[PDB]
RNA sequence: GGACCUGGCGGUGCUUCAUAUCCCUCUAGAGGAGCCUGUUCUGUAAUCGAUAAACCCCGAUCAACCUCACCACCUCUUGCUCAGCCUAUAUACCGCCAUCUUAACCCUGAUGAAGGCUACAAAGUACGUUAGGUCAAGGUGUAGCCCAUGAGGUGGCAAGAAAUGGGCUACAUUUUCUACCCCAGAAAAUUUAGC
Ligand SMILES: C[S@@+](CC[C@H](N)C(=O)[O-])C[C@H]1O[C@@H](n2cnc3c(N)ncnc32)[C@H](O)[C@@H]1O
């Protein structure tokens with residue numbers, strides 16, 4: 096509960112309210128509709144001139160829905176509890192058949208040359224928008240940050256590399272991109288060279304590797320994993336990767352997944368793993384804290400039954416099936432080295448803001464670790480804070496103190 | 498120091514625009530532990546001036562840079578490795594000077610300062626040469642430098658400069 | 662124990678696909694509503710939906726096969742095919758109950774024509 | 788360490804052809820005017836925000852001198868009826884739509900790994916899932932505010948500029964108007980599909 100009617104007041108630092116309107120309040124983090132770079136948009140279409148007919152529309156849709164509805168692989172432990180429960184009810188072959196149903200069949204996707212094109216036509220634009228929104232968080236609240244180095248685990252189509260260039264292009268000097276699939280690496284380099292096998296890379300310093308380097312000595316300023324931890328075959332694999340990524344993180348670790356229950360639970364495992372440091376004597380002894388979106392390091396209050404996701408509207412790459420703008424629903428967590436900058440953390444709006452006559456509905460994750468459904472009105476809370484919430488939107492911060 | 502990663506053989510092949518692993522016509526030492534061993538056998542390079550020949554990918558260059566040298570002069574014949582060496586130089590400000598040219602014709606007597614010139618009868622003059630060159634180029638080079646030692650000129654204007 | 666370790670007969674009607682409804686399969690419900698000029702096809706459809714639900718809920722595990730809902734004027738003949746597992750007295754009790762309840766629900770003289778079979782009559786296997 | 792067996796070659800090149808998809812080939816348009824929109828930037832205290840709820844009554848339509856929404860100011864409240872709000876919730880249920888998951892035998896090799904064909908013939912035969920959408924032709928509950936999320940009043944608000952995406956109109960001589968429904972008289976470059 097970070098909203099007490101009549102007690103909580105807006106936080107006026109930098110002499111905000113006097114010096115600026117309410118529509119530009121510092122908790123505003125909304126990003127206008129994302130347009131991809133023309134070089135990327137042109138390159139993607141050129142690579143698809145061979146086959147972009149009616150079959151491709153069906154293929155792109157099938158892949159998009161399949162990836163969206165994927166569940167995390169069922170760990171064995173979950174499997175025996177389901178097995179015994181069905182066993183007691185029946186009282187082995189019958190149980191297994193009843194276990195093939197009511198359980199999710201998780202399969203590896205071998206990203207070959209064919210399925211790599213379908214992925215690029217389905218997730219390049221969507222993935223780019225989600226990562227751009229995540230990076231906007233780091234820029235907006237810390238505009239002095241000028242990273243010189245970046246690593247991207249699970250670099251399928253290079254969306255992270257392009258998004259990082261659009262924000263920190265004047266200071267980044269190295270883009271390490273890791274991806275086990277040869278075809279995806281082949282596709283990602285074509286996209287940097289204007290969609291042709293021969294050309295000059297549009298971004299300088301991109302390094303492509305097939306295996307994740309494992310060494311605490313080499314440490315990157317921004318480590319990014321976007322829509323990649325969901326492709327790992329088990330929780331042990333996710334545990335090992337996230338530990339390595341954190342060990343090689345210099346300032347910020349940006350993890351982004353789908354805005355589903357499977358995605359959100361995945362990131363809360365990684366969030367707890369980094370926060371609950373287990374290494375006895377790490378090379379980098381600095382602690383970790385959640386830079387965004389959580390205003391606390393306490394357990395997620397929405398992880399029980401609900402999820403936590405955010406939305407970013409973007410303009411899809413022109414195709415035979417992309418006409419109207421789309422929305423990218425994603426889950427994110429950003430983990431930063433060091434300690435929180437100050438004690439004046441602000442609630443996060445984690446759900447669409449509903450504007451109604453003279454009152455506004457905001458669902459806030461508060462610094463104390465609890466969600467608060469606040470209906471803000473001018474009479475109860477005040478003219479200033481009501482106007483701040485009137486202009487706020489999904490994924491913004493609410494500047495409230497005491 | 499934060500130096501860029503050593504290029505891999507695939508990156509080397511693409512950089513040389515060969516598109517294959519058979520038309521390379523060259524061998525590289527892409528193991529930093531062996532290059533560390535070589536630079537260790539080269540002696541104590543603390544605040545020393547090193548003349549490197551035939552770097553290529555730059556494993557020897559990185560190993561020398563990790564040693565606390567004062568200034569590393571690097572002469573490379575192939576232009577295609579110069580961007581990588583320039584990234585290396587950007588990583589280490591002021592410790593790397595890249596020159597394009599042939600080691601068989603490059604003039605080293607002018608490269609370094611005249612204050613490093615010590616008498617012949619004294620100890621070696623804090624200037625070292627290190628090299629992993631093609632075997633078709635090291636024999637002419639050593640013959641040329643043996644002549645220079647006989648004349649106490651060229652790289653040996655500074656004194657009894659040591660070579661590895 | 663681990664995911665890698667974890668990872669049919671048909672009747673005549675079940676066997677046939679929909680595109681045989683006028684070639685090999687027939688029609689279960691029969692009424693004049695859908696004909697050109699005739700009215701209340703939607704009402705007859707709703708009647709059939711409720712009636713099938715209620716027959717399947719009143720004779721659980723007894724119906725070997727789908728019903729046949731025939732209509733002559735007011736008359737509503739439910740020609741169902743059932744099994745011989747449940748006792749005959751319960752068949753009679755249920756028949757009386759269902760006829761009376763459906764007659765008072767549709768306000769028409771509903772009737773039942775059960776046909777018991779020793780077991781489901783298989784046509785083939787799919 | 789010697790000999791042998793099955794291999795896989797996530798294989799690599801050339802030779803020939805089948806060589807349809809895609810090429811060439813054929814038809815047709817798709818630039819330009821005028822207005823309405825999607826997105827961006829700028830600006831405001833504010834919403835070029837909406838009419839099972841207004842102008843508009845040739846087509847359409849914009850702001851209407853309407854009401855709701857917004858901004859700045861104010862007033863009342865035990866009020867209406869143990870008042871009132873459409874305020875949230877299908878991220879509560881149901882319904883409805885949609886996503887995803889759910890062989891045997893016989894021979895050969897000395898009875899080794901192993902192998903088995905010739906036609907004028909030589910061992911071969913047989914339901915769950917979803918921070919899903921929908922509160923417009925549908926329901927059952929659950930929460931909120933009640934000196935205000937209720938009821939009123941006084942003023943204001945009715946944007947500006949591009950680059951690109953889409954859409955609507957007229958665009959003619961093989962045409963147009965009258966009579967007829969065809970023998971009359973007067974006018975004046977890329978692409979995109981398609982067989
Ligand atoms: C779903 S794509 C991520 C897309 C990318 N982040 C983007 O924004 O476009 C995941 C990639 O990770 C790779 N991958 C899967 N398992 C991996 C592993 N164990 N180690 C390294 N890469 C892996 C796959 O080859 C695949 O290309």
Ligand code: SF4
Pocket residue numbers: 388389390394395396397398402403404443445460
């Ligand atoms: S912002 Fe709040 S609800 Fe979302 S993941 Fe963080 S703690 Fe959970």
Ligand SMILES: [Mg+2]
Pocket residue numbers: none
């Ligand atoms: Mg829902």
Ligand SMILES: [Mg+2]
Pocket residue numbers: 944945
């Ligand atoms: Mg208005």
